[PDB]
């Protein structure tokens with residue numbers, strides 16, 4: 001996800017500007033929908049979650065604007081339990097205690113019912129492994145473990161008038177951890193880590209940990225007032241982009257895993273170069289396609305030297321010359337992607353990680369992708385030249401092999417056409433003759449998982465974009481009708497609707513449409529108007 | 536005529552006053568109510584006019600009933616959310632909520648239920664599936680909200696490093712994480728940088744050994 005705020009002393013307007021874009025899988029219809037809701041208590045516009053009241057993540061109310069990126073706090077622990085009693089007891093300290101067992105059943109369209117066991121220890125439910133064999137994994141997650149009052153925040157947030165009031169209003173939010181970045185008409189900007197995080201050791205962040213020893217238990221909650229926050233920082237710039245929120249010597253353990261800092265860095269760099277950021281400048285940072293890896297790729301391939309195979313040497317010259325932009329127009333960007341996919345595939349097979357998911361402990365739906373994980377770690381290992389997992393190969397051998405393989409996979413398509421998402425309705429595989437109607441129309445788009453324009457992919461599956469900005473927005477705080485937004489297909493979830501897929505056009509261009517707040521402009525532009533009346 | 540009516544007037548049991556819903560040039564609804572309860576009721580209603588299939592599909596995924604629509608490919612995801620106790624923790628959450636949040640949730644689903652009773656034609660998906668929509672309870676929104684962020688973040692990485700243990704060894708498995716570009720840009724303080732801490736194999740040894748044994 002990306003967001004940023006720019007302080008009044010660095011904007012073209014002399015008021016805050018907030019902008020960004022949440023990144024999720026392109027499930028259809030999009031998880032977020034645009035709404036404007038007014039009553040006597042509030043007048044708010046932003047993104048809603050169909051089926052949930054309110055504006056949990058993205059909105060302004062005419063005084064404060066707010067938006068989020070996923071913080072990558074560590075909010076889920078896995079415990080290795082030791083069981084006995086044929087699964088009926090689990091160890092805690094030096095005592096084995098009764099475990100909860102019950103039975104449940106789901107129905108399956110076109111198949112038989114599945115019956116199954118729900119096993120639960122004092123840490124939580126068993127999600128992997130068979131307790132009858134003596135060990136299994138349980139999950140203790142802030143999302144499930146204790147009473148959660150996040151829904152109380154939804155009725156308080158609309159009434160906030162300043163950044164600080166917004167942050168009070170979110171007290172008790174724990175369903176998910178967000179960098180909540182906010183701006184207000186008084187001129188403030190802020191970033192709060194909005195999350196409930198248990199107090200417990202750094203070690204729990206690396207692996208499932210022993211459920212019996214007491215070394216690894218939660219010791220209460222990190223207090224609200226201890227969560228990282230900053231308000232009106234002195235550089236006048238806030239950026240968050242799933243990157244590590246605080247240094248690891250911070251006194252509470254908060255994070256082991258997060259996204260690399262490429263996106264935040266590139267956003268930060270462009271904002272730093274522009275101390276008169278205007279509303280119109282948001283769209284250019286959304287669209288940023290520079291890959292952080294061009295330099296490393298170039299050095300390594302350079303040092304690799306001419307190949308013997310002819311297709312492979314051609315691929316090499318092309319990659320060595322590439323400007324590193326994942327532009328929709330760029331054919332060489334597809335070839336970089338093909339090469340990186342082949343590289344990642346080879347490293348995964350070679351190391352045996354491809355088969356790591358054979359183990360019964362891997363069976364937590366929807367499962368981990370070895371290629372999808374290794375893809376992000378390859379740059380580190382390549383940069384450090386660490387061939388520790390390549391079973392005798394050097395990186396130069398992997399690279400060379402990847403040139404050979406990748407050269408057979410060059411479609412020649414511009415990256416836009418190579419990467420174009422195939423937006424797949426949930427019923428398209430069950431009703432394939434309806435796929436044409438059900439799947440909203442998609443256009444060519446650039447970017448990849450590393451670029452601010454974060455249209456990422458499934459490396460084991462192919463180059464096609466599978467996740468990216470579900471929406472983009474910029475808030476002109478205190479000149480609200482100048483705010484703008486877009487969603488990746490449209491407001492409607494009805495494949496027949498004129499608004500099922502019409503926003504895909506500006507979205508694919510990285511352009512946005514007016515986020516209208518004045519009722520008099522809304523009245524002037526209404527296409528349909530409906531009264532919803534008492535009985 | 537595969538589409539619900541977006542003009543005229545439509546009744547909602549439980550409204551105190553009229554609510555006006557204007558859809559702009561992109562179909563985005565701008566909803567104007569007097570009271571807050573009317574606002575939430577109208578939002579339930581308008582959500583459903585555009586997104587009924589999404590809402591119910593997302594709820595079914597939350598409640599482990601999606602395989603009833605999607606078949607075997609959703610079976611294992613349904614089993615997982617059942618094991619997690621979605622219904623139990625969403626009911627629990629709802630009972631603990633203050634009166635304004637309870638009222639917002641109740642108003643919201645009375646708007647959803649009002650849409651279901653409105654006599655709109657059903658979305659094309661219900662036609663395909665031969666299905667009829669099921670009514671909404673207040674705690675259902677909590678389940679839909681929980682489903683949206685379900686298991687996001689750290690669990691996958693821990694599960695992955697554990698799976699790598701017997702394949703590549705401890706020293707290697709503990710390097711399996713997203714790159715840091717050589718050194719993180721932090722969010723707080725803005726602009727600050729720092730080197731992340733690498734795994735302490737010595738402190739992790741007993742966890743590692745326990746898992747090796749358990750997995751082997």
Ligand SMILES: N[C@@H](CCC(O)O)C(=O)O
Pocket residue numbers: 001002022023024057068069070071176242
């Ligand atoms: N989509 C995110 C915001 C952060 C992004 O997804 O990383 C969310 O809504 O949790």
